[PDB]
């Protein structure tokens, strides 16, 4: 409801900009905020700015585009601010358009929700009836447009030059830089892209004044963030966390704690470019300083926590085979490296891995950080990183042990029965394909380790369950 | 929803490919339409709807290998669908697959689907005609 | 031009805007390595081995896509970029088959040479390669992607400066690879049989069919009589192969080899040429005389051509009815040598050699036929050439020189700037000029269009009374371009235009022995073919011109009567027919 906006303080930003302080004055304020990039850059967001504006274009016109696309899985941070109140995104890029001189832009939107990109339709239709966005906006002499496009988010296309070939309607093509995309983007001169969540503070920062944004927070990092919580987590939902917030606080009293009275081993943060923090650090702050020393990156705001049940070579492969198929392909880091460390542990898993190869990986690690062309590439290993500096010893129980704690790494663990409880119903006999379940009525079935696929569909068949993973 | 060949390649290649601007484009909106009412792309009519453009077909067809956004031609009669998800793989499907490799024909991969979880986790797996 | 400052490895430098530091180092003696790059064509630095240092980076990065700034002070000599070239060589090696015994060029694959540069020790990294499958059914080119690493030079050599662009990418991770719309053939698809496809790929993975196994069978007949012939441009070549200093001529040793494989008859390409200039002269009175179809455009290479009747077909009133000169001297030594010699016609082969790969492609269509026979029925390339001498492995650099055979291989300069670009019209021109005028002319003014190279435009005044205007236009570009200007008909002005398939001339074909980028880089080889080319013509002792050698009008007034003849109708003109399209 435009109307119900309006009631609530909308659109209040735009009338004071447009006819009281000059586009040099604006630049400068969220310099005195210490706004960052939240779309995991970490470059001073208003520095880029002053080379928008002060570049060298040779047709007089620039753009400004916006980044609505959500990468990580379960990361629903960019959907809910576009279900729940685009009037203030639009508004933003007539703030951002006033600042550097722009006069058409683009929105990026995924075609697979139907939630937002109706909702967004309506919210542009109404607001051009007002006058807001068109022609002659509040009886001043700037004219700005905007169009509609339809994307459906593929995950190599969140890079920033991924998007200037989006709307080219070429492949996906990540461009080595310089020359930069606020220097040389679309047809060859400067654009702007920032993402929703930097948009939503601009009319708070304008309308309240910078002062109180760099009142909150700590001293390289001012401000707030929101994050996305998830995993094996009691309560689920949304959260709005200030800078100064470390990581016991957030899981316990926050958080919920860990649902059916299980205890915490560690947390993943950032998605598939983050890693996993365990218990060692939750007395930590979390920051872009702070996380980089630790071994992870902020991401989408997504958080992954777990427990015991799971294998952490099993989680350690289920980030890397999202990013698998999602490699555009072009390093050759990227295209042929990436499955060079998945044969690894796969063959460790089954239990084929041999000795020597805990050190393996370690070459491998810092050539696809280095030479990786998109961001994808270096931040493959931001996992495998983390995960051998802090949980280095328990893939010797995969390597010598060939026991798996958690019982869910599959290929190697044992079934046993434990005679107490179950009565020898033999029910799962019949059920296993293998015929390595021997055993008499009124007594508990015998296995042959040897002769199982350890495919498990005996343990449901038994209805005592009494059958452990050993 | 899928009315052939004929009309609806007449009906919307004449109708919304001639505009301007979006090079590509909104050619990539109409490739969606496509997937909205053919369930797949087709081989022989790329070559018409690019000489209606005028442009080759390298850049079309590299947008078609591009994404994994859409389906293309394999489509017999029906399909099957296995619920394999995560929770699915935890039921386990593999005993019904072999049993249908002795029966129905070739396994999974080849026409005589992979779904990913739609909903309705408590009832795996699901069995999709 | 803007001046801008930077420090290579301590030492101070200005130079232009748009100058990489890649381009910049090689100018003041320092080298790297690249796959990726090529001039002016490929841009990408997909290949990441052309790393430098940059001071203050949070990464390394790649040096032919870096632009320089103001005072960036860089180093090439790090512990860190040797181990993360070693690394990302060690990865890229992992793909491409190790049997290099059965690579086709072997010790020119410049990643051999990174590999033993860059001290390469083990190959710790086994593993699993992609989808394998040959297609060995083409009749000119043949991919084997178990050899390609993907560096997309092959697409973009076809897709732009040629003007074709019928290759591109499919699939992810391993599924990404090089491939022709829609995964079949490259004989049904609108190829051209460019051959700049295959002299641009780094790593052999685009070959020709080695045909020498039933070259081998004929020349083990011995009831066959066997005849050799040499193509005008091909001498300058073969000690490219041989590492021969640049632009040797090696046309009587190489005489004298073919002598000694004990090839029954050896004759070249100028005499044929001669005879088709005069023809093509003859066909220019009629058309003029006659107020035929304007332009005419000749028929020397089979490459345009086929790409006009297979993407043009509305074109066709204006080509010519007359062949390839290689097409005449087999129709010619297959009728007139064998009456003379009274030798069976069947009994005879005749193979010939020219570096342009689309022969390969009219030696496949039958409708070239004398009596129900192909005019020629074998031919190789300079490189296969290089292979079977190669073979014989006879000590090239010290054999005496010989002389070629009576009467088919005399020799004049007009037709040794034949394989030249330009040449051709050159010839016209001069003997249109001496039969209608008298005129005697060796070179022509030339006004190159500004902004396009490889079209060029002249008015010479061949007769007071008309004025012809010369159109040459070679490179893939230039015939699109010119043929859009065509298709809406404003040039109907000119009379001729010159359709060169390959850039560069034939001397810059694709049988030609490969160069390395590297090589490209200091001088364009072209020039000096040029230059060796313009030594042989102006050292040409007797003639300068084509019509005034003695045994063409012998062979005129004994066999062949009279140019445009009814008999030569049949025998020497012939008709085209537009080809199925399926891109
Ligand atoms: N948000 C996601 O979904 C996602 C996915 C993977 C990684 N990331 C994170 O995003 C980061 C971006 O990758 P990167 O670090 O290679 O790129 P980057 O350093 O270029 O950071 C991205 C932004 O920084 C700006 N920038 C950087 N240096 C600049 C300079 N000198 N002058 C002007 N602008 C400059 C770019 O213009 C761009 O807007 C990754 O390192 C990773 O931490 C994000
Ligand atoms: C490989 C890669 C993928 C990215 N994916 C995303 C994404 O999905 N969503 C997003 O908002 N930003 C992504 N970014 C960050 C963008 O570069 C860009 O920074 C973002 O659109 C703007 O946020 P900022 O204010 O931090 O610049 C990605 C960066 C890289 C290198
Ligand atoms: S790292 Fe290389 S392969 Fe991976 S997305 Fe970037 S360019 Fe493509
Ligand atoms: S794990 Fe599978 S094969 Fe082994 S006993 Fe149980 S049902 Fe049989
Ligand atoms: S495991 Fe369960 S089903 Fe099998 S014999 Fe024991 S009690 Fe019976
Ligand atoms: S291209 Fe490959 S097979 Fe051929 S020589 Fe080079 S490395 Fe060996
Ligand atoms: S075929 Fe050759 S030129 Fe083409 S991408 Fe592969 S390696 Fe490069
Ligand atoms: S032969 Fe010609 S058309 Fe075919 S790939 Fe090579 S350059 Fe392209
Ligand atoms: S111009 Fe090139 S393609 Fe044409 S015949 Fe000569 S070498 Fe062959
Ligand atoms: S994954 Fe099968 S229904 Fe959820
Ligand atoms: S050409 Fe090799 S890195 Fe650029
Ligand atoms: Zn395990």
Known sequence: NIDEYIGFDGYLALEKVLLTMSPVDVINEVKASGLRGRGGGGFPTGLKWQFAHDAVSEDGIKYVACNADEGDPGAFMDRSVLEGDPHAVIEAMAIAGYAVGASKGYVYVRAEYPIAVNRLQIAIDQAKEYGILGENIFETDFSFDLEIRLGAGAFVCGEETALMNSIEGKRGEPRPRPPFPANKGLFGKPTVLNNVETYANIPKIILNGAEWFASVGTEKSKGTKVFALGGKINNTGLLEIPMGTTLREIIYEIGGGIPNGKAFKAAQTGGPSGGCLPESLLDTEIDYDNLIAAGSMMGSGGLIVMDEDNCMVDVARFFLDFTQDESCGKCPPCRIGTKRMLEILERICDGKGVEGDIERLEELAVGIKSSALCGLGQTAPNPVLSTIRFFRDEYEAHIRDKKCPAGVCKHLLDFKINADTCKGCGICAKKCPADAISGEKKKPYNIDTSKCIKCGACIEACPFGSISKA | ?129 | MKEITFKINGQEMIVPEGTTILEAARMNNIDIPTLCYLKDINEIGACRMCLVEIAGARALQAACVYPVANGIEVLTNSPKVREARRVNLELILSNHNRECTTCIRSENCELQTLATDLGVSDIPFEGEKSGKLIDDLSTSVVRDESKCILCKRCVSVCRDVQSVAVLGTVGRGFTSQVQPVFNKSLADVGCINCGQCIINCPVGALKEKSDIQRVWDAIADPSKTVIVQTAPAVRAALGEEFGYPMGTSVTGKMAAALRRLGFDKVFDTDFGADVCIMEEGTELIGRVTNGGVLPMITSCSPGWIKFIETYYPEAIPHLSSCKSPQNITGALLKNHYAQTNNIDPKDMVVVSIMPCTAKKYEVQREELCTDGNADVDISITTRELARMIKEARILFNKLPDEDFDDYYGESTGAAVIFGATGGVMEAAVRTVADVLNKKDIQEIDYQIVRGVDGIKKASVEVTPDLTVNLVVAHGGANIREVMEQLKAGELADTHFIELMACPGGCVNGGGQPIVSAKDKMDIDIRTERAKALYDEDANVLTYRKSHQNPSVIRLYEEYLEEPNSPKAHHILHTKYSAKPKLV
């Open chain 2, 1 to 129: 929803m899928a009315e052939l060949i004929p009309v609806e390649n007449l009906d919307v290649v004449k109708a919304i490919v001639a505009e301007h601007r979006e090079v590509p484009g909104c050619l990539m909106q109409i490739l969606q339409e496509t997937q909205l009412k053919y369930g797949y792309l087709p081989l022989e009519l790329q070559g018409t709807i690019a000489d209606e453009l005028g442009i080759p077909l390298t850049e079309v067809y590299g947008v078609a290998t591009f994404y994994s956004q859409f389906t293309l031609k394999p489509k017999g009669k029906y399909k099957i669908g296995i619920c394999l998800g995560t929770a699915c793989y935890v039921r386990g499907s593999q005993a019904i697959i072999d049993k249908v490799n002795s029966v129905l024909g070739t396994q999974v991969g080849d026409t005589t689907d992979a779904t990913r979880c739609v909903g309705a986790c408590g009832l795996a797996p699901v069995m999709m005609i």
